[PDB]
Amino acid sequence: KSFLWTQSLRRELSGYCSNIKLQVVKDAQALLHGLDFSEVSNVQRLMRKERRDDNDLKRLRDLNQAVNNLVELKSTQQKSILRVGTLTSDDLLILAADLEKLKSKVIRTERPLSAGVYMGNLSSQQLDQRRALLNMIGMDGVVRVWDVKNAELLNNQFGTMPSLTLACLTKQGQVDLNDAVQALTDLGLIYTAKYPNTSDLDRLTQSHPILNMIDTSSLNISGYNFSLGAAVKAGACMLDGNMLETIKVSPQTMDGILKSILKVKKALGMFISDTPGERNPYENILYKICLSGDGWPYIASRTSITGRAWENTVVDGLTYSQLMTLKDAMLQLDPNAKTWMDIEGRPEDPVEIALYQPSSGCYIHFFREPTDLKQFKQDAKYSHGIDVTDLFATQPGLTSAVIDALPRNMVITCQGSDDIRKLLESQGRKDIKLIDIALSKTDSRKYENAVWDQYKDLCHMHTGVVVEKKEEITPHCALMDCIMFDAAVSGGLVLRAVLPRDMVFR
Amino acid sequence: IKSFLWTQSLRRELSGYCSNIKLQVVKDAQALLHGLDFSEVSNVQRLMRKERRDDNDLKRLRDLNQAVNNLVELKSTQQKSILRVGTLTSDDLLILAADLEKLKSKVIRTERPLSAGVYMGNLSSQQLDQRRALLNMIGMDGVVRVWDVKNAELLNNQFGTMPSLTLACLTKQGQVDLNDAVQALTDLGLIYTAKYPNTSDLDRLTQSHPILNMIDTKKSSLNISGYNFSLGAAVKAGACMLDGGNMLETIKVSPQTMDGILKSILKVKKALGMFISDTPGERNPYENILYKICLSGDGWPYIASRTSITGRAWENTVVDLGLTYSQLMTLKDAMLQLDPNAKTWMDIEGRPEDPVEIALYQPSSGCYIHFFREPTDLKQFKQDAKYSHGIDVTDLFATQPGLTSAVIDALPRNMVITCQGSDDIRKLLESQGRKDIKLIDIALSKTDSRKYENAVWDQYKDLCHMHTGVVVEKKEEITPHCALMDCIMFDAAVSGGLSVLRAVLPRDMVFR
Amino acid sequence: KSFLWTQSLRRELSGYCSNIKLQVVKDAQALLHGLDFSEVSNVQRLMRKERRDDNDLKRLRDLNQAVNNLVELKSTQQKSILRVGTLTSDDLLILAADLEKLKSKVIRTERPLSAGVYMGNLSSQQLDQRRALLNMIGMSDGVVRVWDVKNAELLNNQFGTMPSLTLACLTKQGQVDLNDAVQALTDLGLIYTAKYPNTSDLDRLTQSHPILNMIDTKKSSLNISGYNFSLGAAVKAGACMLDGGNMLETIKVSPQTMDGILKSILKVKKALGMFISDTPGERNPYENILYKICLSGDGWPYIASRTSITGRAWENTVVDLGLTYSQLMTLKDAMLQLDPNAKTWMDIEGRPEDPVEIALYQPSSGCYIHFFREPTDLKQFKQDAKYSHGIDVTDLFATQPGLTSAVIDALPRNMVITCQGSDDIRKLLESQGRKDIKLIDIALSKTDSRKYENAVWDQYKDLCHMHTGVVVEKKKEEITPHCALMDCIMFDAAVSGGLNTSVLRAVLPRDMVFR
Ligand SMILES: [Zn+2]
Ligand SMILES: [Zn+2]
Ligand SMILES: [Zn+2]
């Protein structure tokens, strides 16, 4: 089915594909002449680590930059806005929907590597389910691969590139470049009729010893790894057959390529999955083309590109796809840990909600549009300083969705109990026990300045002047409150967002 | 399923109040077989198949219900209960108070539209879709209603299922021996000890017990009567056939046991997190048992004849120790009766900044909104009482606060409202944030405006009892001004003449 | 509970279930028309007896054969070898392990009915423990046994329940119309879709179906036959009367479907944590389905006539890829047959430091323990082969290891053992940690020792096939090989001045002696 999709796409997109063997070999030679393969070996060692940090990421990013500098097959930062023309009104609606679905599937696959999944004190069933998910995506108590300050620095750092694969086989396998070319060519030939399997690879290795370097998935790896996928991709570039891997996109050709893909989607019933893991051919081509309107989507250096495909190509409560992402995101929470909660606005009409787990530093933080504008106006002047118009751009529906998803029989700490209880009960969560810590106003805000000094960047929603019946005071933020209340209890004063920022805001 | 788990846990906890009542159920079934006119049963079934039913239809139903009640021994008795601190704790009483409030809303929203109706005329596709989902969920001039009746209170308690009646009708109308009906229902009962019987179960049962083919599986507990062969009624009857299994259906309640029964229900509620839903439609097991027990302190909540009982559960059982969420949901659904397109009068008593009586009136359909509010300025109110409305401030204490904002918020978008003096109404509507509502001032002279004053009070005096004081004009005594009667009399003045009216708001919402 | 496991199996195995009512009724009609129900009554009478013999077993087996001859729903002898494919390598390991555990549970449940349990002169504690076992397996001189038979293997597969038989018996013996029985059982089947019917349920059904009064609800699935009116038999028959419902009882197995059925069962096993019990008694639904499927690759595991099938489930289905706890429990229960007070002979072949054959013999009862062991010292073994026992070392490869220690460790405390050479038995018992056992040395001359040698081999040759080599004595001349078991028997005959003609009883299952 999947190879069928690939073949149909090849046929339909043939006019956008060209022979690029010469340039790919040329790039491989530039890498052989100028790249430090000891640092390649170094990044391979790092990718072998079960758990990796910002020092590890720096080595990877620096090496990717070195590679990018040496090669000519590169993608360029190029945002696309798709408008009615070549693509119809209906085409744009389909593309909008599939990008929404693709966003969920990709985030659910890649995000856990950095955000983490709690794997501690849970039921046998819960552990089985989470173990299944981790296994499907190639992955105290929280399991994560990347421990980093800024997960955005992971974006686009893990692509496979034919020239790199070719240069690494040659140098690291200690064979002549032509040996590597001949071997990948033969693999490319198989790929005209079939996706090559382990038996195909095993057969080839007998006449091409360099192929024993291939470990016979596309997940939790880098371009410096010898995956079958990377080898098949390089092989495709070696052939004289309309291989998809050789497609080039330009701002002039973007829309026609997408139109062509949509033709294939309709004829074959292709779809974006709701299953985390390897991309199917439609998911893969849609992601790769949307990353940039100017490059070679399968085979260029993309390591200097910023942003995700759904950010870089745009079509001019929560969805089903958003809910799946959300339910998966919430698996980062430790249901046994001390968890603070605070809200701004009335429990019957809340406008900001936060939960905070000090031990791990994870937090849930989001906003809601007010129902009662008159009371919202007083709350703004006397408590939170939120401009109602700034809430227009926040994502609706999270109040129900997040409370529904809180783990069963949790214990939540607050200041104080009454509003949180009313809010939880409103969403049917009577199983959650509450601790009222009951600090005096003065003690509760001891660390108010210390907290804002440290964590101001975590919330930009509080813009209005707030008063106490008058004198100006620091606006109340549901998040900063959790933090400062915890700091007061603890006698002193990290942080991971549980929710993706693109889930909190629309 | 969670539903059956609540049922099972209720059975376990309430076993001591369960009884062996097969013999009594079968005795009552025999009494119906001997004494009831089953051609009249057939007649009521015919009327229940009608999409729209009227007072003549309701008469047939109530008469047949009375005939059944006359023949059977398992009957509930009118028994008011007041729950005090004792067996039930102070906190228990708070919980019951809150749950009965929520139950009220859920039941009214399920049942009231059958008689009050929902406008389904000229609306947006979105509004029509939303209202269809509601009508579908509750089993239902552009208004859709099932019962067109003069007094909707006469619908109360007329639709319950009874095992003796189900047994008798299966037997007589299915043309089988009583023993065959008992045998089939017993097997259904046995299934019910372990699960809620579904379509699959009933189909297999039917192959061995063809009497059960009378039961239509794709048919709800809603907008039906005790004369209908629902799966629910069949299961209820089967439960009574067991003499065992701790079936809730067999519980008897007495004044001495009521609090203990409720206490037991609350234990299970806490243990399982049972709740009253805010979803109109079929009752969950907790909703069902609470409703049934609270109807009467002396009877068999599930299985007795209750057709002679007056009042609702929240009226017959009371707890002694602005709008709630539950009340607002009831209001918003009640407002669906209005035709946003129709001529609509509005009138108020008290100043726009401090109104004490508000009414809206749609003459074409006859529906009206009418409610009250406590004054903020008692000095101005006293002047108004003497020279306009004759309202005794103390009489406003029994009225529900919070309706001015809630009703005005809920008025349909771009409604056009007709007014004898638009200035006051404009102020009030604007003060409530509703600048979108267009107004028409009719500008009748004082004399022309009151041409039909006596004619209106003559017909409709029963609709308002708030005007008690002598009102004068500078002096001579005059008839007090009522916001509702003023809407009606002004419309009459315009139309050159002066219908049973329909209250949009339930009385139990206008008064507390 | 166990009903959960049943429901889960029905859900997973739905595709293998089918409607069989017509076929069951047809077979019931064949039985009604052609079976002698007076002989059914006769077998019911035999089954009421506390002690039953070979004449009784003949009556049962013959009646089973008459039934088998009349019905179409029969299983056929079909060996299965489970190989990697539909079943994974790991799946085969699991099945192999559960089949080993099932062997132990079933043998411990059923074997005592024939092998028997000594209940004579024992301590209060021993008698208590033993009665508890007898109670749990449905057994309510000194030896308690239900079946006294020449060949216990003739009990195999003779006691299964069959829906057509149950229906025919209820109809004929209950004196009701066939349709009356069918309808009653249908109503019981309907209840079974939702729960396992209990006595209160049956009581309610009996009110409208008087035929159901024939069912005894107290009585277990143990020590009964297909001619008995157990609740289990009735529920099984009712399970076959339905149209749909995924009743496991309707499952057919074929050589094509066997592996997928096992794969599905293993799916449910993992999901619910199903298991084979370590305790004798009634089978749980997993034990039950695994046993029934494994008996034959071509049949209706629950409902066909299986009385013509030879072999046990662990023999008819095999997996291709010291004692276990399960095997040790089997052993220790088999040893309960021994009278710890009785005269007991013991003899060995091989040196005491390296025995290769061990026998114990209680002449009064006739019971014997007999097993083998592979030698450590091949040089000495080869000489012993030539001058003593004539055993081919390669024939010892199929014998079960670790029995020497296990059996000797399990011997009764303060037992008195009689032997021809005391010194070698002492060394052996000491070497296995049993210095407590008193020995009597008999001290027969070589000639007097073997007076009855031909007479014993004439009577008992079928009891040992291990001695194949020519054995010689230097003058060389050929002599009859020495067997530990035959030696026990002939030494006893020499002392007693005679050899009676008696059937002996093997204490160990042949399945324990060999692997
Ligand atoms: Zn904030
Ligand atoms: Zn009035
Ligand atoms: Zn031997």
UniProtKB/Swiss-Prot annotation, chain B:
Its EC number is 3.1.13.-. Residues 48-224 are annotated as: Binding site for the cap structure m7GTP. Zn(2+) binds at E357, C464, H467, C482. GO terms for molecular function: 3'-5' exonuclease activity; identical protein binding; metal ion binding; RNA binding. The keyword Ribonucleoprotein applies. GO terms for biological process: negative stranded viral RNA replication; RNA-templated viral transcription; symbiont-mediated suppression of host cytoplasmic pattern recognition receptor signaling pathway via inhibition of IKBKE activity; symbiont-mediated suppression of host cytoplasmic pattern recognition receptor signaling pathway via inhibition of IRF3 activity. It is found in: Virion; Host cytoplasm. Mn(2+) binds at D347, E349, D486. InterPro entries: Nucleocapsid_arenaviridae, Nucleocapsid_C_arenaviridae, Nucleocapsid_C_sf, Nucleocapsid_N_arenaviridae, WD40_rpt. The record marks D424 as: Important for exonuclease activity. Homomultimerizes to form the nucleocapsid. Binds to viral genomic RNA. Interacts with glycoprotein G2. Interacts with protein Z; this interaction probably directs the encapsidated genome to budding sites. Interacts with protein L; this interaction does not interfere with Z-L interaction. Interacts with host IKBKE (via Protein kinase domain); the interaction inhibits IKBKE kinase activity. Encapsidates the genome, protecting it from nucleases. The encapsidated genomic RNA is termed the nucleocapsid (NC). Serves as template for viral transcription and replication. The increased presence of protein N in host cell does not seem to trigger the switch from transcription to replication as observed in other negative strain RNA viruses. The N-terminal region is important for the cap-binding activity while the C-terminal region contains the 3'-5' exoribonuclease activity. A CCHE zinc binding site is present in the C-terminal region and may thus contribute to the substrate binding and/or the specificity of the exonuclease activity. This is Nucleoprotein. It comes from Lassa virus (strain Mouse/Sierra Leone/Josiah/1976). The lineage of its organism: Viruses, Riboviria, Orthornavirae, Negarnaviricota, Polyploviricotina. The gene is N.
